[model samples]
Target chain A: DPKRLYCKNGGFFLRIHPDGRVDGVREKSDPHIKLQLQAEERGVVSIKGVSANRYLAMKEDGRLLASKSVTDECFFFERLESNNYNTYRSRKYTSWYVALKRTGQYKLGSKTGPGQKAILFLPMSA
Target chain B: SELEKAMVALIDVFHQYSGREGDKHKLKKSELKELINNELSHFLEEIKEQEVVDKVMETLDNDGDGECDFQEFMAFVAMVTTACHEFFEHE
Candidate 1:
């Protein structure tokens, strides 16, 4: 119930396979793909992959570098808004977010500035 | 078919508030507040505070535009509905 993170635009379910690959798929019942959220600090949450046994980490170059342990690079803060829509930012980068491109590929980028793309925090029940 | 009906209801509800003001396809800040207050009063408390609505608009209004389009609005739907699903599932 308190597990999955879904993207709004494409309705992609955030999937972390046992092989440590994070993908946005359409299936809602992707087993062992739920996110286990833990409060890292004030306004920060570290999401651990249920199947992969890893945390969602971002490299300094705005890349998806999976980490085995929860680190500053994996901590992200939430911005809860209306209709339950929320946004998140990595604690290490603080500028980039889990954003979607017009092509539907997801990435971390500086989206808070101007007209850059921003990610929406939608929920999916586990 | 309940989920399909709910999907239709969502679309209908969005159009109910979207065409009232500036952009017919978009919901202005005022329009968004009115919609939330009227439609989502049951689950989401009536957003009376202006600052709260302002922050919400800021978050949902991707691309820095002052209004929420269908895409942005759908994002809201996804989040709220998913959270609701979580509550009921855990209940």
Candidate 2:
């Protein structure tokens, strides 16, 4: 079941627990968030979500690309020419150890940067 | 359009030597004999005017750091090639 996860501030935030590893179980979901959620819901079977600890986000313009999260894993989805796109990380990366693909079960569309144009994607091996 | 050509041109514009104004620019090579013969002879000229040299310096120092190494120089040259050889022939 997909839910409308909203941000109370201006964007979403994930606080790194002092234990050095973030577990989804301990963190409680709050309604007050910073980022505006604009991800459109769709049943994507061929696209999957990418994985990372943190990410370099994108600015939201009117492109097919947007941001979304399904099953608690964050994803930044971008729209390239027609079938190609760049999937960055949910965590800021030093070396590029991520995904670039044309197939997976994806939750496409969600972007918020105020005035910029482009989004990031997270794809995993589902 | 091409890196090698752009590098050659960029060197032609910015390279310096020990001569006078309008003499030409050339870079020398204490590193290799190949560089000495082909690339080092022209752009590294010592004698040149201050004005032209300044113009060349501005174009090359895109970051305004006052010095440009090989990597930065190469970045200014490389680009995507989308056209086929036939496309050029028709033009």
Candidate 3:
């Protein structure tokens, strides 16, 4: 099943553009927001944009990038939070997470954490 | 969660083959051979020769346990998935 990862704090969906840009978009109907989550291992998954055919990856320096092929940096440890939202932390970096700001912009993974509202995402099926 | 179900499926598939013989948590060489030939027929070639199975087991047996554990099997799946992804991308 494809999902729209809606950021609760930002009121936006995580979008991976066809040009390999990673950001957040407010429109629910945006094609770029549809993503497929592939489970690579137990509690570890890779998020790939359904339309863009790109995998969401966080680099060692916390920069968000859309990778054409799966890499070590692409796998994320998916955790369900107490609030029922999910937080995707990098399997490679461990501490870094997939996040977005209140302005619907990409947030650096290095500066994000489970406690941050920017890091909380609700996986909604549309 | 789709990913959760996929992970469970992988574990279930491993156990289905691993429980057929000694060490229910691990897959013996024969179990591994049968698994690859049966389950992964679409993604991988048939393991008709003992030499091919031996080479695969040797490569995956990182701790030299002479058996394929869940962790070792997962690593093999990852490699296969990566290869499949690359192949599709090139097409």
RMSD of each: 11.3, 17.6, 18.9
The DockQ-derived docking category for candidate 3 is incorrect
In model 3, the runs with Cα more than 4 Å from the true position are B1-91
How would you order the candidates by DockQ, starting with the best? 1, 2, 3
**Cα distance off (Å), candidate 1, residue A77:** 0.6
Task: Report the Cα lDDT for residue B24, model 1.
Answer: 65
Give me the candidate number with maximum lDDT. 3
Q: What DockQ values do the models have?
A: 0.04, 0.01, 0.01
Task: Please tell me which predicted candidate would have the highest TM-score against the true structure.
Answer: 3
lDDT to native, each model: 0.63, 0.26, 0.77
TM-score-wise, the better of 1 and 3 is: 3
Q: List the residue pairs that clash in candidate 3.
A: none
- What's the number of clashes in each of the models? 0, 48, 0
Model 3 interface DockQ: 0.01
Q: Candidate 3, overall lDDT? A: 0.77
Fnat, model 2, is: 0.00
TM-score of chain B of 3: 0.70
* CA-RMSD of model 2: 17.6
Per-residue C-alpha lDDT of model 3 across residues B1-91, encoded as one tens digit per residue: 9989988998888888888875568877777767767777676542232323434555678888677787888876665455433322221
Better of 1 and 3 by lDDT: 3
State how far residue A95 of model 1 sits from its true place (Å): 0.7
Per-residue alpha-carbon lDDT of candidate 2 for residues A56-93, written as tens digits (9 for 90 to 100): 23223211222233322233333322212223323222
